[PDB]
Amino acid sequence: RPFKQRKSLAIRQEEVAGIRAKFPNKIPVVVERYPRETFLPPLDKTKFLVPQELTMTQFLSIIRSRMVLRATEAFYLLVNNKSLVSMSATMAEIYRDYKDEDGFVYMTYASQETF
């Protein structure tokens, strides 16, 4: 039920190819709730097409705005569910350094997580 389970690699790469053509100024991000989260609500969508200049800090607020319940609680946003990245980085910086082989960049949100 993670996105990478629901769609094959070739299907995901084809989706990014169309996104890159139609939305060339945007960064394609897949944001998913950490599968073990008990507090924060799910979002009402998975794919965000965000400006290149938007910061991680700003993006947090966009993700919060898409939660099905308006929870104000802090949460972490983990790139590949494993990299805590600079919160002043832009979405183009994060895409350049952390995009998946499929062409999306993946982030998981959690209110707590142990590695």
Curated annotation (Swiss-Prot):
GO terms for cellular component: autophagosome; autophagosome membrane; cytoplasmic ribonucleoprotein granule; cytoplasmic vesicle; cytosol; endomembrane system; microtubule; organelle membrane. Most abundant in placenta, lung and ovary. The modification Phosphoserine is found at residues 83, 86. It is found in: Cytoplasmic vesicle, Autophagosome membrane; Endomembrane system; Cytoplasm, Cytoskeleton. One of its GO terms (molecular function) is ubiquitin protein ligase binding. Keywords: Autophagy, Cytoplasm, Cytoplasmic vesicle, Cytoskeleton, Lipoprotein, Membrane, Microtubule, Phosphoprotein, Ubl conjugation pathway. The precursor molecule is cleaved by ATG4 (ATG4A, ATG4B, ATG4C or ATG4D) to expose the glycine at the C-terminus and form the cytosolic form, LC3-I. The processed form is then activated by APG7L/ATG7, transferred to ATG3 and conjugated to phosphatidylethanolamine (PE) phospholipid to form the membrane-bound form, LC3-II. During non-canonical autophagy, the processed form is conjugated to phosphatidylserine (PS) phospholipid. ATG4 proteins also mediate the delipidation of PE-conjugated forms. (Microbial infection) The Legionella effector RavZ is a deconjugating enzyme that hydrolyzes the amide bond between the C-terminal glycine residue and an adjacent aromatic residue in ATG8 proteins conjugated to phosphatidylethanolamine (PE), producing an ATG8 protein that is resistant to reconjugation by the host machinery due to the cleavage of the reactive C-terminal glycine. RavZ is also able to mediate delipidation of ATG8 proteins conjugated to phosphatidylserine (PS). GO terms for biological process: aggrephagy; autophagosome assembly; autophagosome maturation; cellular response to nitrogen starvation; cellular response to starvation; macroautophagy; mitophagy; protein exit from endoplasmic reticulum. It is a lipid-anchor. Ubiquitin-like modifier that plays a crucial role in antibacterial autophagy (xenophagy) through the selective binding of CALCOCO2. Recruits all ATG8 family members to infecting bacteria such as S.typhimurium. May also play a role in aggrephagy, the macroautophagic degradation of ubiquitinated and aggregated proteins. 3 different light chains, LC1 (a cleavage product of MAP1B), LC2 (a cleavage product of MAP1A) and LC3 (produced by one of the MAP1LC3 genes), can associate with the MAP1A or MAP1B heavy chains. Interacts with TP53INP1 and TP53INP2. Interacts with CALCOCO2. Interacts with TECPR2. Interacts with TBC1D5. Found in a complex with UBQLN1 and UBQLN2. Interacts with UBQLN4 (via STI1 1 and 2 domains). Interacts with UBQLN1 in the presence of UBQLN4. Interacts with TRIM5. Interacts with ATG13. Interacts with MEFV and TRIM21. Belongs to the ATG8 family. This is Microtubule-associated protein 1 light chain 3 gamma. It comes from Homo sapiens. The lineage of its organism: Eukaryota, Metazoa, Chordata, Craniata, Vertebrata. The chain holds residues 11 to 125 of 147 of the full protein.
